[PDB]
Structure formats: structure tokens, C-alpha cells
């Protein structure tokens, strides 16, 4: 449900995800690096299923962050694909892909894969 | 076809993969890296479906290569998961995971993912 996703979340490395779920299936917000002052905020845009199933199934969603802001440009973008599972302890379980811009010759190792779990802290 | 996996395969980067498929599901062979070289060879071991479905489906398989031999140790290992499809133009289509041994602090970025298509040409 949009409300449930909306809010502030943190993952196991200490990064901050602040998101607003809109009625039309859109996701907008900011992603912040693990601790590290204020200028470590990047823009994120995504989409979720605004009409999930009844059942105790999670809500699929995904979002992207290109790691460029006014202070730094890591020439890479990360996409997280996962499910929001509500309850008293809501969580967003994801798998992510981080791709860096490379030359033709290093393209073979341009992408990293991992997984993060987010815990909600504020609405 | 079944032991059609046996042979020498090449991927788009130039690596050569030589494997023997045992009747019971084993995959054994050598994986050689860049230039052809001499000890650019690493051991590989895997498993495949020795009784694949009798419908035009490919044969599921996978194998691993630890990047250490008596000349180099790149402290990493790669696993390829995919399927074999035979015919006039046999191919092995895979997706792989390359994990490097790291310290905790670097564990989050210890794994790369990619895809390779191997042919006998």
C-alpha cells in the first residue's frame, strides 16, 4: 500500500532511503550513503505495484540511483528490485545490480550484484 | 545431444573451455584464459542433467573454476549456470557469478555477474 512504503528506511550497511509512494505506482525520494555528512544524498526514482494481491504476498517494486549529485560523480548506477512486506516490522527485501560505465574492454566486469534488507524507521 | 557437451568451446572473450561429460552427470575439464598461453589453464568441475526432458528443452548445467593454478592465484572463483542446446549450432548459454575473497568491509562488493555464450567455433 503506498502509505506503508512511504517513510524512512535503513539497510544493514547504514544507508538511508527516504521514499514517497504516489497513487500512480511512482516512487520518488533520496538515497544517502552510510553515515558520512549531508552531501551524500542522491535522487532515486522507481515504481511499485499499487494494487498488490490479499493475501500475505509482498508488493513488488524497484528503484534506481545514478551516483552523481553536485559534489560527486561515481559514474555508476544501481537498481534494487524486491518486495515490500508490511506488518508491525515492515521490511523491503531486495537484490541489486550496480553497473559502472566502462570501456569496451572492461565491460565484462562492469556489474556487481548483492542484496540489502531495509527496515522502516519513520513515516 | 547428450554427450554433445563433450568438446572444446569458445566464448566471445576468447577463453577456451574443454570438457568431458560423464554418463552420470559429471563435468570435468580445463578452462584456459587469454592468449591461449601455457598456464592460463585452470581446472573446472561441474554437473549437468544426464536425463534432460524429452521435450525440445536445453540441458541444465553449471561448473566452477577457482582462479588458482601453479603459477597464479587471483583469490576468486567463478560459477557458470546455464543450459546446453544442441543442433547444427550447439551453444551453451550462461550467466555467471565471480566472487573474490575480501575482508568484511568489502564483502558488499565481492561479486560480479555477467553472461557468456559458448560455441564450438
Amino acid at each position: 500500500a503506498e502509505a506503508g512504503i512511504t517513510g524512512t528506511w535503513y539497510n544493514q550497511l547504514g544507508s538511508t532511503f527516504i521514499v514517497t509512494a504516489g497513487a500512480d505506482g511512482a516512487l520518488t525520494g533520496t538515497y544517502e550513503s552510510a553515515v558520512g555528512n549531508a552531501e551524500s544524498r542522491y535522487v532515486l526514482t522507481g515504481r511499485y505495484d499499487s494494487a498488490p494481491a490479499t493475501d500475505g504476498s509482498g508488493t513488488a517494486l524497484g528503484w534506481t540511483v545514478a551516483w552523481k549529485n553536485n559534489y560527486r560523480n561515481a559514474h555508476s548506477a544501481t537498481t534494487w528490485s524486491g518486495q515490500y512486506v508490511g506488518g508491525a516490522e515492515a521490511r523491503i527485501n531486495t537484490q541489486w545490480l550496480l553497473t559502472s560505465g566502462t570501456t569496451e574492454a572492461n565491460a565484462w566486469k562492469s556489474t556487481l550484484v548483492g542484496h540489502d534488507t531495509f527496515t522502516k524507521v519513520k513515516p | 545431444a547428450e554427450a554433445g557437451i563433450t568438446g572444446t568451446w569458445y566464448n566471445q572473450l576468447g577463453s577456451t573451455f574443454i570438457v568431458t561429460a560423464g554418463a552420470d552427470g559429471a563435468l570435468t575439464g580445463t578452462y584456459e584464459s587469454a592468449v591461449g598461453n601455457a598456464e592460463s589453464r585452470y581446472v573446472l568441475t561441474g554437473r549437468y542433467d544426464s536425463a534432460p526432458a524429452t521435450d525440445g528443452s536445453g540441458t541444465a548445467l553449471g561448473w566452477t573454476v577457482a582462479w588458482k593454478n601453479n603459477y597464479r592465484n587471483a583469490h576468486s572463483a567463478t560459477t557458470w549456470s546455464g543450459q546446453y542446446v544442441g543442433g547444427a549450432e550447439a551453444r551453451i548459454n550462461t550467466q555467471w557469478l565471480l566472487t573474490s575473497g575480501t575482508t568484511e568491509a568489502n564483502a558488499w562488493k565481492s561479486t560480479l555477474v555477467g553472461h557468456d555464450t559458448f560455441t564450438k567455433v
Binding site: 550497511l13 547504514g14 544507508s15 550513503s33 552510510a34 553515515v35 558520512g36 551524500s40 542522491y42 540511483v65 551516483w67 560527486r72 561515481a74 555508476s76 544501481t78 550496480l98 | 568491509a105 568489502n106 558488499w108 562488493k109
Partner: peptide
């Protein structure tokens, strides 16, 4: 990388 933890 901004996606990983704080440095040493």
C-alpha cells in the same frame, strides 16, 4: 563508493 559502508 556511496553504496558501501563508511571507510576505515
Amino acid at each position: 563508493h556511496p553504496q558501501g559502508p563508511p571507510c576505515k
